């Protein structure tokens, strides 16, 4: 997308991730783990369901219309009937083609932005206890077990607790 996160500073996706659209991965004192982030995945799938509900919220009921096929050749008024229909189709064909183009473009944009939103959210929590490694990866400068990683996932990481150790590991 336009935010350059998906197919960008995050080089590629994860076929291993099967339980969410956006998640984490890590390595620490208690091995190496993967963990989806639901709130972002829920923000993504709500908007797509919104689009799909908006596109699929109405089909106009229509009854007695003009004749759209003929057997003989009549002349003047028969042309107008074919023309009115031919014009109607072209305009809806355009309206359908543009809608697809705009919507799909917005889909790849809002999915991308949500990938980036999560990154800035995770950064903001870490404060001065981690530096951006690039590739969509952080480097936390203290021992961060699964209990520690879990607080980040659930939006409850206190930087003050690990500030001194990390701040000392960064500059020595």
């Amino acid at each position: 997308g336009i935010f350059g996160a998906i197919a960008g500073f995050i080089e590629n996706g994860w076929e291993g991730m099967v339980d969410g659209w956006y998640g984490f991965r890590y390595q620490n004192s208690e091995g190496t783990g993967q963990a989806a982030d639901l709130k972002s995945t829920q923000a993504a799938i709500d908007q797509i369901n919104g689009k799909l509900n908006r596109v699929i919220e109405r089909t106009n009921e229509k009854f007695h219309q003009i004749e759209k096929e003929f057997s003989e050749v009549e002349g003047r008024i028969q042309d107008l009937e074919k023309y009115v229909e031919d014009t109607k189709i072209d305009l809806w064909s355009y309206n359908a083609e543009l809608l697809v183009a705009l919507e799909n473009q917005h889909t790849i944009d809002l999915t991308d932005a949500e990938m980036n939103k999560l990154f800035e959210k995770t950064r903001r929590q870490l404060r001065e206890n981690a530096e951006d490694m690039g590739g969509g990866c952080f480097k936390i400068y203290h021992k961060c077990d699964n209990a520690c990683i879990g607080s980040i996932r659930n939006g409850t990481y206190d930087h003050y607790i690990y500030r001194d150790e990390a701040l000392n590991n960064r500059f020595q």
Binding site: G20, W21, E69, I89
Partner: protein, 319 residues
């Protein structure tokens, strides 16, 4: 360990689906959904709506009362299905402004017939022909009435049928076109026949024409069909001196949601709110490429046969 790596990512798949965008024509996403209904059931569902098969009868054949359309005398419909294998087995007739009458009947959605007593003085009723048998004996369009002279003379008839009812009456009438000059003086006595229907808001005078037409099941003559609508309070009036095809009564018009459709599609039991000439289609996708002719709660037709809608992010797998 004194450090910890914490990467972020997004999911990917092995068989992504391509879509169009403002910039990219064929960009691959995780998952997309169809918006153009391409396939059909192959038959018209007749539960969502009351669908009536016309069979061998056209909507105008049944209206007039063609011998092989006796089933459709009081029957009504939501969607009338005209067939390609349909015929007109009665007197050779034509209609100036045919489709207009076909529309009015199809839109009304009913062929219920309330008859009325007209005072046909000095003429004989129930005229028939050999090209319109009702079992075997000669007959005629059941809702029309062929009048001819009584004995020695054809009197200049003149009837009034007032509309005391509170709706639009639709009277069907016509004029006969003999094959030869003898026939005009044989059947109708008077030399120059004529028919003049006239309401308070309009007039419709017609003149017949004596001449040979092609051989239509024996008959070399014709009958031009006409129609006259009468509003509440307005009176009906006819004024003829020959060649009058008398009206038996009137059909009940009504602003319904009915229509007519040409199709050779099978009509079997199912449920579907959109009917085409190819059979019913589901109305969940917004567009369709089955047919431009439609009836019911239908998707809007377009020329494209497929338009995928991304329902997921861009897909980028591992190398």
């Amino acid at each position: 360990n004194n450090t910890a790596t914490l990467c972020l990512g997004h999911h990917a798949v092995a068989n992504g689906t391509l879509v169009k965008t403002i910039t990219d024509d064929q960009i691959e996403v995780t998952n997309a959904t169809e918006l153009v209904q391409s396939i059909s059931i192959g038959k018209i569902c007749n539960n969502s709506y009351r669908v009536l098969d016309g069979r061998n009868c056209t909507l105008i054949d049944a209206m007039l009362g063609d011998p092989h359309c006796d089933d459709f005398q009081y029957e009504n419909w939501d969607l009338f299905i005209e067939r390609s294998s349909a015929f007109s087995n009665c007197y050779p007739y034509d209609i100036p402004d045919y489709a207009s009458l076909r529309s009015i009947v199809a839109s009304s959605g009913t062929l219920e017939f309330t008859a009325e007593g007209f005072t046909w003085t000095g003429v004989t009723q129930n005229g028939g022909s050999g090209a319109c048998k009702r079992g075997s004996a000669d007959s005629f369009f059941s809702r029309l009435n062929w009048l001819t002279k009584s004995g020695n003379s054809y009197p200049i008839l003149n009837v009034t049928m007032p509309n005391n009812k509170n709706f639009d009456k639709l009277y069907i009438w016509g004029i006969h076109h003999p094959s030869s000059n003898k026939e005009q003086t044989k059947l109708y006595i008077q030399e120059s026949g004529r028919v003049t229907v006239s309401t308070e808001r309009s007039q419709q005078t017609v003149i017949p024409n004596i001449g040979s037409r092609p051989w239509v099941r024996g008959q070399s003559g014709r009958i031009s069909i006409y129609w006259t609508i009468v509003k509440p309070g307005d009176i009906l009036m006819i004024n003829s001196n020959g060649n009058l095809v008398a009206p038996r009564g009137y059909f009940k018009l009504r602003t319904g949601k009915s229509s007519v459709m040409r199709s050779d599609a099978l009509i079997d039991t199912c449920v579907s709110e959109c009917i085409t000439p190819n059979g019913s289609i589901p109305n969940d996708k917004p567009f369709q490429n089955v047919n431009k002719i439609t009836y019911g709660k239908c998707p809007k037709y377009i020329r494209q046969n497929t338009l995928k809608l991304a329902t997921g992010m861009r897909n980028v797998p591992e190398k």
